[PDB]
Write a protein that binds this ligand. Structure first.
Ligand SMILES: *P(=O)(O)OCC(C)(C)[C@@H](O)C(=O)NCCC(=O)NCCS
Lengths: 1016, 928
């Protein structure tokens, strides 16, 4: 609450974490030298957050290494920068949101294929410009004139290591089609996949969504190879070399439904694409934006032309941005992608924001001193427009990612423009830092903007400024002191003139098109915005805590491994098993690995490994690598045709402590149980939660006043809670089939009735059954028994028994019947003559018989008032002879329907047979104990389905939390609707969520050579 | 609910340019062809693809293909001189860029927006292109290929060169969505316009069939190209399409801007949307669900219920498989809920023009804009019967195969334009017709004014005067200007020209491009205009023709003279016949009434006031006040038409006006200064009479030569150096005639002024104290214009300098001499050649000419505003015409204001000939 008490609490916390003197560790020394590391900093930040309510980021915590600074910044916040006087208002005129960058994909010279490699190269100041590879441009070196012309040119630049490799099998392309595809499209596809993986957004979750694609390209270089011989050219080249296909194929493969356009502004194509994506996101029209640019050096025509122009290409191939010896640039090939979302959407979806885009603008030079001559006035105007759109004063910019082409004539113009706009009004001791990534990677023609954006995103995320290389000294024609600019040639921290990191990215095409993007770091403000049963709950929680203290239980972590092919899934499982056994895998929590796996792409072939620790996970993954079956591994080669069917059974499925363990260890289950308990209290005037939380309640005559009613009410509540818990994780039934007491739950889940109506129906039924049985005793009782007679075979035996009635056809070869006890044992004795199976039920409920006749009038009066609704799900009404009802049909759940269901028999096996005939193979039962799964299996086997999926939710003598995890795992494996990300919720937003994810291996591709054989 | 969720404006279409097969180069020709149902698909021209027909394999492969489609008549022609391109550079330019430039110019002309007025403005360019076909010719021989092809064949250059040539400062991007490129470009332009970021948007698409590679590939695909080359949209015998080449452009502005600028709105764009098919049944297979979604999104953005759509411009590629999908989507969205008797009319322009790959959207938008503007629906051709696989009655669709009126189900015409690329990109644009709601939102002097107006009306009834209509003809070269003038003269003499009012021709000419070489013809009727244009055609000089070969280096200098420039009826004619002049005269009169307690408007409107002793109580003061008012009114009238001075130089009584126009003082401060000066001069002269009077005289002595003669005259003082060889001096009458007699010995020129004002001498000494007290309170301001202060020895003062117009400055100006010729010499030395005088009568123009001639400038531009015995309305028109001719700042459109908005403005413009281009053959010599 105050600075001093916060400091004392922090000292106590570090003392507890280290065991030191606890009273002499308040030094000015940093926590790192006190004995702490980066591992416990996350826990300390979480403890600070849950006590104070403020969220601290990584940069803020690291910039304050000592106890006093952290204590001051937690209470008083970050110090406010001193005000400055400006003659203009730079606030936003429009009401628009900020754009959050969540994923980065890089394909750059120097084997920079991941953002981490690119960041390491930038920190090391690596030069990625090399000579022309010996295997490149071989189609043109066989002609003596072309060969001698190429040797005269520079031909030095940034080249990709493997430009011919492509995984055509992954993208479902034939060899003939794959050979005619521009490498730009291959790079676009690969970078889209890699950016989606980096953002930790599953690709399967974006199918059918409004995702926009904006890719910038400049030249169709691969077309020339196709048309080298016009007759041998294949028609596939029309689609494989077109510029619009670069984005159209990305949209098609990933099933994106947003805008898909390819832009062309020469050297500002990537920045223009990013600007268009941002403008699309701000104006609705899209939810996720994929922006970037690609460039490939397929043929030497452009390089030879630029060399013939003269004074454009550097003799040594190095780009010396803003240096005294700048003499041109060199052409490079590569590509990059970014994933853009609205900041509110990113905050609500739990995405990790890498950087924030505040605004951007584009314009043209106009009538300059020639078509290829840059205009400083237009650059100043675009800077002003971009900073007006971003709502940020240009005086507060810390770093400028300039064009940096290394020309002796264009660098002074760019510096003059920056001094006109960015550097105007700055004090001499606060200059804007300047640099360019073209000094490292070369001039990526249509991908310069993508490289610059990736570099600045990595710099903002990692809180460091990479140096600029090939800088011998200041340009004599540029007065950096007057322009208030400084070249950053070393590794340095963000100056943070305005208190936060602000950067600008510039890029100008040779045709006069200019663009500028304003970026800022993510801030902390972007990540924000029943009395008796109570004692039983308290004592149950306190007893559960005592048992956990004696022995902590091991959580079951489901590990999801999937791919588009079974062999690829096995290879990925083997690689994951290898990674987990490594020391890095051992140092990561099993929950983090599961969370990282749950946000990967969920392919056609899926598998789930249920493990408690690292060793079990390794063993399961090793088993999954081969075809060996394992009890801890669930796998399938593909999804099933139709959705699952929920079976609302539950007769004879009660036990002593059903639902108690899941109530304490799950919040959605507890919430729905409390809701149903409140509804029953409103209806029946007593709480079922007291019975559930009680330990010594056997749901029998010796422990319950109304054993018949309470069992049905508790089973109904458990079914409703389990169904809603399944709906919480994204599961939904394709069809619903109910049984004698599960009809209310079936109606509720099918949309026929609301929760209150179904609760009133089940309460009325149970209470009438309980009350009516009390008066019926002595010789008027009716007993129910199970026989091995089918639907038609039982007609013959019933000729000898007039009073016997059929209760429910559980199985094709089994039937439940009820009647007078002297008449029930008679048919049982007759059945025993053939050596069949016959048993007498021990419950005196005696439903679906003549005994329920007096209760129809009372049932009708109590049920008068319910409002039936049209069904939103397929329904197999066992009351209506198991007839399937299409969704959207007329309401059926009227009073007469319930009267018929309570009075007449239940055609359970007919509904299951109809469901099998409709193509349903997965059956899920919501019950405290699986009792009807055997009946469903018997019905399916007789129907010609020997491999049906029978899934249970809760079972006796089984852990209820693990049982539900396994039930959802089976649904996920068979391709049913289930959000696997919901199984690993995030509890932290800022620095406390640093260890939420593990560094699992990425997806591996089998690249094959695909190229056009051409000669000249 | 289909109402708009966002608060955005509508986009108005003001200009259309067409370059389509069938020689449809103008919107009128295209509309006539659409009404006639013309088929524009022909065979391959004999002069096309000749670079590839010399190879036997390629030649035999081409003959196997279809090769029928829409081709341009002259694809190699290009006016490189007009666009300032060398032959080497012009030969390497993609014809797509040439079409983009030509269509931009033609669309700007059609919109009646001068191209020179958009230079430096935020104008966005969005052009859709699909293939770089001209690149293949360049790289046919890699060694012979020139580096110019890099810029001449790049796709971004298609828009970058348009932005560069026209000096556009807005976004310039080239889009690529195969067959929806034009629609996507239009959508991007609309979104840019709605989000600020731009004021004018140029959208469209181009396509050229340079090489047969794409056609041969599509033929080799099979089942794509129609065997006969005709597109039978929604017909029972649809068997493919044919590829065509062409382009089109549209000029887009916000509807409020178009309304305020007086532009003629042709059609209104309500909304648009774009999306993608996603994972369809193959990459090239269209998806009906995505098309339905894009229709819903576009109609949600437009804020219009799809049930109210009258006509749908469908994709209409003529495929037996895609037409049912498009019809199904239209029935899902557009046709859902309609009654059986109100179907949505269906058609496609591809049946007429063929399949313009990257220009289908431009052609469809042009067709729908023409249909909305002309209130007619053109028929759809090649329609033998309904498609058996399409149930038009169920889908509530009907093919319009005849000329029919707009059904107007919702009371207004609403149309939709659809276009889908083969890659899965879909687009839809919703258009509506322009509605009527889019084009909306001093007592005594009074009697003198009434009687003057009634007498003027009586004279006009006896004989109506003929208005002077300035005709502006301009071009980038003098020869082109002469050719255009000759063509205009030929057109005017034609019966169509005779049936058009001369004012309409002038209004049409004033909204054309104002080039480097300009000329103005001042005419009263058609015959005078014809004679002037004929004279302008040759190099013959004509008094009614003002011409110049180019602009001057520096701006004009306003001379605030006026001493001895008064006459009986100065400013009376212009007051009655001009509203801005009258408004500013009334404002100055009100200021003087506040200051001096009497109205100068009564003197101006009075007829028998000679501004002398026999007609005015205070002849000295009233003349100065009226001259100051006239100068202020003339300057503000010139500012109304866009004129602004580059520098200002004043004289003895014009210093207040010079300070006001230079930004030093406000109107009230200058009015108070001039009123105080005039009243003090008038009052002081009354007490000075008898032998103490001072007389002013003009002599032929220079600044330094007058020093020697002044040794004999101690009391004589110098008043103003009017000319390098002339000087005005003042002193005692017995001492003034003495030096005059001495000057007459050499036979020089000497005259005595008849005005007893005697300013800038010792007589004004007692008035300094009174002047300081009255002037105490003025607030000087920094100068916003160059100033040649004749008080400060004619020293030039840069704009933005410290204020100079304090009380001491006025005291020194009233007491000391005026260095008029020094300021003019400094202005000449600064590069100023144009001098404009604001006065009721040009008196100092002779002095300015004498000074400039002595300074080495024998061709200076001396322009007068008002003159004696001259029509004041025609004098001001001629003065602004000279400013326009010499390239000075002047909005020539302000000379022809529009008084009507709707149907009453139908005859505001004439059908003057368009700009003519000299097209030359520019092509790359290639062989295989
Ligand atoms: P430790 O050596 O395991 O370090 C872990 C870490 C907390 C530094 C890191 O994994 C993390 O989650 N935060 C990184 C913050 C960052 O890179 N930017 C700020 C650097 S000062």
């Amino acid at each position: 609450m105050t600075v001093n008490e916060m400091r004392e609490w922090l000292r106590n916390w570090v003392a507890n974490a280290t065991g030191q003197s606890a009273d002499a560790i308040d030094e000015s020394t940093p926590m790192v030298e006190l004995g702490l590391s980066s591992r416990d900093a996350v826990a300390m930040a979480s403890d600070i957050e849950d006590l104070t309510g403020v969220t601290l980021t990584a940069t803020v915590a690291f910039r304050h290494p000592t106890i006093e600074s952290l204590a001051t910044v937690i209470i008083e916040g970050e110090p406010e920068p001193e005000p400055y006087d400006e003659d203009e208002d730079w606030s936003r005129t429009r009401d628009v949101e900020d754009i959050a960058i969540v994923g980065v994909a890089t394909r750059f010279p120097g084997d920079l294929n991941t953002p981490d490699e690119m960041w390491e190269a930038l920190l090391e100041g690596k030069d990625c410009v090399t000579d022309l590879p010996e295997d490149r441009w071989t189609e043109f070196l066989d002609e003596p004139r072309i060969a001698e012309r190429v040797k005269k040119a520079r031909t030095r630049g940034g080249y990709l290591t493997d430009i011919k490799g492509f995984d055509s099998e992954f993208f479902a392309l034939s060899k003939m089609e794959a050979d005619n595809i521009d490498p730009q499209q291959r790079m676009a596809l690969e970078l889209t996949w890699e950016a989606l993986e980096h953002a930790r957004i599953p690709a399967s979750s974006l199918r059918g969504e409004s995702v926009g694609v904006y890719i910038g390209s400049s030249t169709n270089d691969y077309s020339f190879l196709a048309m080298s011989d016009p007759s041998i050219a294949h028609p596939y080249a029309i689609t494989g070399t077109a510029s619009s296909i670069i984005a159209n194929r990305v949209s098609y493969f990933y099933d994106f439904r947003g805008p898909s356009v390819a832009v062309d502004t020469a050297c500002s194509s990537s920045l223009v694409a990013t600007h268009q994506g941002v403008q699309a996101l701000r104006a609705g029209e899209a939810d996720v934006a994929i922006v970037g640019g690609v460039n490939a050096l397929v043929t030497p025509l452009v390089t030879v032309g630029f060399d013939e122009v003269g004074g454009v290409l550097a003799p040594d191939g190095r780009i010396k941005s803003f240096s005294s010896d700048a003499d041109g640039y060199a052409r490079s090939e590569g590509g990059g992608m970014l994933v853009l979302k609205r900041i509110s959407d990113a905050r609500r979806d739990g995405d990790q924001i890498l950087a924030v885009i505040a605004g951007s603008a584009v314009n043209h030079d106009g009538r300059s001193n020639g078509l290829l001559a840059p205009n400083p006035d237009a650059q100043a105007e675009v800077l002003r427009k971009a900073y007006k759109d971003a709502g940020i004063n240009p005086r507060d910019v810390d770093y400028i990612e300039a064009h940096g082409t290394g020309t002796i004539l264009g660098d002074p113009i760019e510096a003059d423009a920056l001094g006109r706009i960015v550097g105007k009004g700055r004090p001499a001791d606060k200059p804007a830092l300047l640099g360019a990534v073209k000094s490292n990677l070369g001039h990526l023609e249509s991908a310069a903007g993508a490289a610059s954006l990736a570099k600045m995103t990595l710099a903002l995320a990692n809180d460091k400024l990479p140096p600029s290389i090939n800088y011998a000294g200041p340009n004599p024609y540029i007065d950096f002191e007057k322009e208030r600019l400084k070249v950053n040639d070393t590794v340095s921290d963000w100056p943070r003139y305005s208190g936060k990191a602000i950067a600008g990215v510039s890029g100008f095409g040779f045709g006069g098109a200019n663009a500028h993007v304003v970026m800022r770091e993510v801030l902390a403000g972007d990540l924000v915005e029943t009395e008796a049963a109570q004692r039983l709950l308290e004592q149950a929680r306190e007893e559960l805590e005592a048992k956990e203290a004696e022995e902590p239980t091991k959580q079951l972590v489901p590990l999801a491994v999937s791919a588009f092919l079974t062999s690829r899934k096995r290879q990925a499982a083997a690689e994951l098993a290898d990674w987990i056994d490594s020391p890095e895998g051992r140092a990561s929590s099993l929950e983090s690995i599961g969370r990282s796996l749950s946000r990967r792409n969920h392919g056609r072939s899926r598998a789930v490994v249920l493990a408690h620790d690292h060793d079990e996970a390794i063993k399961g993954l090793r088993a999954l690598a081969e075809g060996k079956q394992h009890p801890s591994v669930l796998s399938a080669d593909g999804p099933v045709t139709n959705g699952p069917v929920w079976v609302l059974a539950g007769f004879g499925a009660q036990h002593r402590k059903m639902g108690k363990s899941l109530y304490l260890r799950n919040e959605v289950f507890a919430e729905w149980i409390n809701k149903v308990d409140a509804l029953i209290q409103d209806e029946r005037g007593y709480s079922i939660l007291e019975l559930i939380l009680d330990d010594n309640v056997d749901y029998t005559d010796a422990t319950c006043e109304y054993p018949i009613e309470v069992v049905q009410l508790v089973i109904f509540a458990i079914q409703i809670a389990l169904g809603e818990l399944l709906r919480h994780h994204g599961a939904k039934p394709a069809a619903v089939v109910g049984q004698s007491l599960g009809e209310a739950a079936a109606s509720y889940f099918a949309g026929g009735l609301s929760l209150a109506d179904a609760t009133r129906t089940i309460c009325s039924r149970s209470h009438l059954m309980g009350e009516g049985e009390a008066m019926l005793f002595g010789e008027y009782i009716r007993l129910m028994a199970l026989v091995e007679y089918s639907a038609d075979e039982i007609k013959t035996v019933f000729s000898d028994y007039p009073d016997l009635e059929v209760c429910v056809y559980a199985a094709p070869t089994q039937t439940v019947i009820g009647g007078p006890p002297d008449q029930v044992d008679a048919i049982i004795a007759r059945a025993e003559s053939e050596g069949k199976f016959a048993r007498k039920f021990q419950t005196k409920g005696a439903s679906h018989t003549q005994q329920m006749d007096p209760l129809l009038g009372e049932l009708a009066a109590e049920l008068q008032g319910i409002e039936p609704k049209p069904l939103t799900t397929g329904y197999f009404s066992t009351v209506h002879e198991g007839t399937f009802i299409r969704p959207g049909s007329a309401p059926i759940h009227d009073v007469d329907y319930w009267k018929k269901g309570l009075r007449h028999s239940v055609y359970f096996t007919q509904g299951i047979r109809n469901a099998v005939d409709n193509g349903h193979t997965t059956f899920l039962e919501l019950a405290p104990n699986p009792v009807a799964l055997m009946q469903v299996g018997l019905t399916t086997a007789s129907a010609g389905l020997h491999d049906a999926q029978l899934i249970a939710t809760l079972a006796r003598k089984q852990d209820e939390v693990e049982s539900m995890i396994s039930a959802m795992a089976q649904l996920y494996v068979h391709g049913h609707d289930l959000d696997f990300r919901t199984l690993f919720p995030r509890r932290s937003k800022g620095l406390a969520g640093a260890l939420d994810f593990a560094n699992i291996p990425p997806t591996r591709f089998k690249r094959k050579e695909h190229w056009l054989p051409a000669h000249f």
